[PDB]
Amino acid sequence: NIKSAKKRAIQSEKARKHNASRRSMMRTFIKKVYAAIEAGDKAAAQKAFNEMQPIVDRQAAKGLIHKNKAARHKANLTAQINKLA
Amino acid sequence: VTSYIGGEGHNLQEHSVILIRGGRVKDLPGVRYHTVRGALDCSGVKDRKQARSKYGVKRPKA
Amino acid sequence: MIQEQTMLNVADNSGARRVMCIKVLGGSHRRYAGVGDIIKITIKEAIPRGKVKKGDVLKAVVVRTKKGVRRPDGSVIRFDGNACVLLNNNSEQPIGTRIFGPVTRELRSEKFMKIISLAPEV
Amino acid sequence: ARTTPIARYRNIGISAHIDAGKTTTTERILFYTGVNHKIGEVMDWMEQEQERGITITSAATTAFWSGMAKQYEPHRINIIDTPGHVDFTIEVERSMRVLDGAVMVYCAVGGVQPQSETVWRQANKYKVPRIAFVNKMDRMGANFLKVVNQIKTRLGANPVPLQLAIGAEEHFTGVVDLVKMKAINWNDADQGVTFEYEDIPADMVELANEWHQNLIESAAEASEELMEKYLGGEELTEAEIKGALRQRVLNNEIILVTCGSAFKNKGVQAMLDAVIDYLPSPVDVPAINGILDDGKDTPAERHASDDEPFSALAFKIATDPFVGNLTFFRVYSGVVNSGDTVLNSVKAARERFGRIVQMHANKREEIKEVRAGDIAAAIGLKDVTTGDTLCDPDAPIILERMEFPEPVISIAVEPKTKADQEKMGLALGRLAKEDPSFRVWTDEESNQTIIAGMGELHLDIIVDRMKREFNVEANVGKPQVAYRETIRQKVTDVEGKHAKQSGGRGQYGHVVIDMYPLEPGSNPKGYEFINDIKGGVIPGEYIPAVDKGIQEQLKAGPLAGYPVVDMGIRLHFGSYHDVDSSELAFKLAASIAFKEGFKKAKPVLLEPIMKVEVETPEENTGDVIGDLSRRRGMLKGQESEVTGVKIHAEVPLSEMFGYATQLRSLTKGRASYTMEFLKYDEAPSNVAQAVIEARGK
RNA sequence: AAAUUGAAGAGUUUGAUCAUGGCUCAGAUUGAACGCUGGCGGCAGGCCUAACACAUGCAAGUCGAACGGUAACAGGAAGAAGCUUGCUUCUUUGCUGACGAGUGGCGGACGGGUGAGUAAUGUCUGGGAAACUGCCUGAUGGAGGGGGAUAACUACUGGAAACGGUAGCUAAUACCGCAUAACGUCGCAAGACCAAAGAGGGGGACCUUCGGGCCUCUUGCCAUCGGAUGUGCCCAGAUGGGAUUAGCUAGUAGGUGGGGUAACGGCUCACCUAGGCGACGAUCCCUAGCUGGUCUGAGAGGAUGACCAGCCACACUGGAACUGAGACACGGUCCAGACUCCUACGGGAGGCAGCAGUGGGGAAUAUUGCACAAUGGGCGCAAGCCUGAUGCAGCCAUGCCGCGUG
RNA sequence: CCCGCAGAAGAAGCACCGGCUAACUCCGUGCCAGCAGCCGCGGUAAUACGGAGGGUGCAAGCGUUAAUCGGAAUUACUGGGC
């Protein structure tokens, strides 16, 4: 509110809204996968994982999340699914 | 604390702001401080010519 | 309806926290004090470094009562508890500089323009 | 630079009795608009901060007045409003020398009043060219001509009425000018700011004709050639009328009087025009006399134009609500520029000159440049007291003014909390620098501080300034009167033996001293010790022990506890014991004999008796005489010099601790008293026995 | 070659002596203060106290060579009129030079200030693995490609201001897809998945739907793999006093699994075990930023941590997060609290421990200065802009040094 | 920075003088006024107080007041004792 670089405030608020939307979508798909896992079928969990894997990769690639975050999401999920059946 | 008032003649009173320095008296057991004359309402002694910076006396220009 | 022995709260930042009305000023045999009324208070509690000390006696004006105020349209505006704004004893001139909680339109006076301007509502 | 041509500046102040409209006019004078339109510089007017960047109203405002429907270019008129109380009269003392002119405001119904004559004397001391305004024409019982005549006979002035009154009370709508010969009735109905001339009104045409003719005679006697030209049957033009009247108004001839009503805003708009027309400019007022530190008179006339090196005059330190210094400075000659160096030539001290501030249109403008005649204020640390010069290192050191009023009322003072004596010391230290007409004291009867001020209100608006400025509370009191005691006409031949020998080394002393009183002040030391011991009865190396043990009791005194002066002593006969007699034996024996011979030598208690001279108007002679006799005071001659009566009376000091405020009530504020201690005498009062054990038993 | 060479005593107990034993002095030093004096210059240093409250001014902006545009000085035009015969004094024009404001980009986390907190999540010394890093740099390739918005603006509108509403395509290097993809991600493998952005300078044709296109140069962008730098984490030793503080701890100490981080980790969650630390001093209490170093000393040591440099911590107090490569952010945000200031009483605004400066506290510590000319930093292709860093000036015998008064 | 300088011209003060500690007389005071870093001086010749002369030391400084180490082998690890 002091320096004209206070447009970083409105800019950061807009970017916060946008990043919140993308984060909520990504984690909604991860929760899709995890709920499908707790339900106990391999095919449904694998469907949801194939549906979230482009999402997590496009989010890591865009600067929302980090390559390692998406990496370990996919890793723990594939491990859970493989032990699940 | 109590403190010594040196020199011949002072004009200090009950409500006189002064400036205090260290230095015992060796005479008064319990007086461990001094009063810098010529500073904060302590007036310099009456025309001390020797040791004139001590006792706060400004000099005759002669 | 504030009367003698009423443990009020304090609505300003004068330093007091709990007071007591010791006399309702204005007219003999007066019983109650309305929101606009100036009373006399003894301080029953204060903060350590506040502008007033515990046990001091001075005036005050009321700003909120549980009894509430009534409007010309009949509407009653009650509050959750009693509260006052300490005033210097000779000229009113509230001691504090902040004010907490709402006040009422019954306080929009030539004297409490200060209170009504520092108040967060009404 | 000095774009507003300096030869146009008018430096002036309005002075009057209390509630006379000086503050009302100051405010009205300031309706200069010039917002949404710089009116100056034929560029950069003060208009930038007419945008109200900093909002405040301050003393000594500057203003641009072009003219009331007849206009002639921006003039920065510089205005110092003046207060009206004798209490605080130093603000009128300092702000009259600093002034070039003066608008002598007056109440059209009150007329001239104690303060009006008082400020008249103030201006006469500086010979200030003064024109007069006559405010309050709407009040019932107000008449311009009567107050005009009052000036002619109450002040001994020549009040030329360059205006006239159109009605009184409600009637007042305009004023008949004697040179325009028109009477402009202002458009107060829409706004006073709007104005309109009217040709030759019938109501005052006979009165105006005779009074206007009187004005032309003054214009005539104004110049010798003009007088003869006035005897030529020819009238005077729009320049010889004013230029004749003006050119000596500069030199203290006649005071121009205009009527108006700053409440209804008429008369005033014209009053500003008269100030430009007749009141002096720094280039019109004669050049200032000057002097150096040693040269009895280095002429040092500092030509006003700022071609001489910077040479100002500082007239008031200020307790600025935020800055804390704000010492206003009036620049006579020279130019100081946003950071320079000048010395306290009256104090022999040196420092820079940092942030000049001139407040105009009530906006506190900050200035990097102050020039000839330009009134401003300075923020600094080093003190410059009122009437102290601010000349360049070139140094026309001393300016002639070395005058401040002596305090007429002195009152004791002490804080409510016993530990704010230091704070009350520092507060009174500051409030003593802020005005020179306020002394602080430390009398030697007791450390009690005495805040000697001019009036009751003067030092009553300072007991609460500590409450306001320095958040310290004080409780005033009557000063303690120095009461010394003595023996009166009873010689006594008494004995005193001090001896406590009940061990190896006791003390033995004895004395027979004949205590007799001396004439009250017949010898410098007051005391007298003659030794008539013979036979070496007391050793004689202990005779000074006796003296030093008697005149140590003179300080204390047996009767009440207060000093003893004017008594003789004769050491008739004593005795000694070689082993036990000691310095502190004839010191104690003499003390004992003193305070047993004093209990039987008829001791009295004496009071200080002043030498009071009162300059009082004739009528109230009997009144002040009777009040001096009300006090236990004795009158000694009352010669009457003209315009006062001189009344001498050696009144006790105890009966004078609020005298002037009461005296002013008795004299209509037209008298002052000067008192100076003379002698001592007695009046039966055990009030001194009342004050014995309350403090220092 | 030389890198060091270094070590003093005296007064005072007694009538005298020896000894023990304290006090005082001789030295050096200082962010010094005070008293008296006072010429100059050089270099340096100048709140040790209230991390007390802060008026005022400036300390973080930049990029029309990303974009829509156009408040002006202009140009390039349309040029009208007076026509001195277009000196075009006059009118229209974003078409350029440039630029107000606006979207976007990078910066704003650097630099600058204080030492309140912190007795160890800090510092120093030496190493470890479980790491990530804008701009800088070395490679390898890529750079298909659609339109869905919104700011200015227009319009209406609310308000004293901050800052909004409510519809419209705007436009973009802003955003999201569809392309496509690996020495990339993840899976053991099989396998699936992931991006991009264009602008400037000119290519004699090499096009003219009238700026070809796409092989002209410079950048810009995406992707992995390095370097470098910066940062995160971990361990061991050393880093104060106090036992007139001896028992402390319950995510506490471990395990498994789930989650979480960029990264290992009780980091977190649930179950399981009952452990873990403590006289080599846990907990508790007091104090304190730490270090290279400065002062003293022959030394060992004692004190110290002002200036300078590295690290840490904090930013009106408490908490949280957001954007971001990097913050849980002096000069950003939200909330709460204490405090203060405006109000056209309905609402708002702020955070000097940045430079200067005010009040205060104090024995005591400076100008509300000049300039971006170097040096450096941010932006930019670059000129240029900003830089209270910095370079300099001002005040002060505050210190070291030189000289002067013959 | 370098040259024109007519002109000594505009530039000296502070502490101390009993011993430790280096520098001595006189006056006026008379356990008073006062000094004092430790020991101490002043009660009639005071090298100790105050002043004058003289000197000593330092000098654009001088002295006082803090404050640290040394001397202090008076916290002894080097390097102490019962």
Ligand SMILES: Nc1nc2c(ncn2[C@@H]2O[C@H](COP(=O)(O)OP(=O)(O)O)[C@@H](O)[C@H]2O)c(=O)[nH]1
């Ligand atoms: N009736 C009347 N009152 C006036 C006039 N001018 C001024 N006053 C009032 O007199 C009072 C003087 O107040 P003030 O100006 O402070 O007096 P000052 O301090 O001597 O000037 C103001 O309230 C004015 O209303 C006038 O023409 N008529």
Ligand SMILES: [Mg+2]
């Ligand atoms: Mg721009």
Ligand SMILES: [Mg+2]
């Ligand atoms: Mg495999």
Ligand SMILES: [Mg+2]
């Ligand atoms: Mg790691």
Ligand SMILES: [Mg+2]
């Ligand atoms: Mg603060």
Ligand SMILES: [Mg+2]
């Ligand atoms: Mg700040």
Ligand SMILES: [Mg+2]
């Ligand atoms: Mg001597």
Ligand SMILES: [Mg+2]
């Ligand atoms: Mg021993």
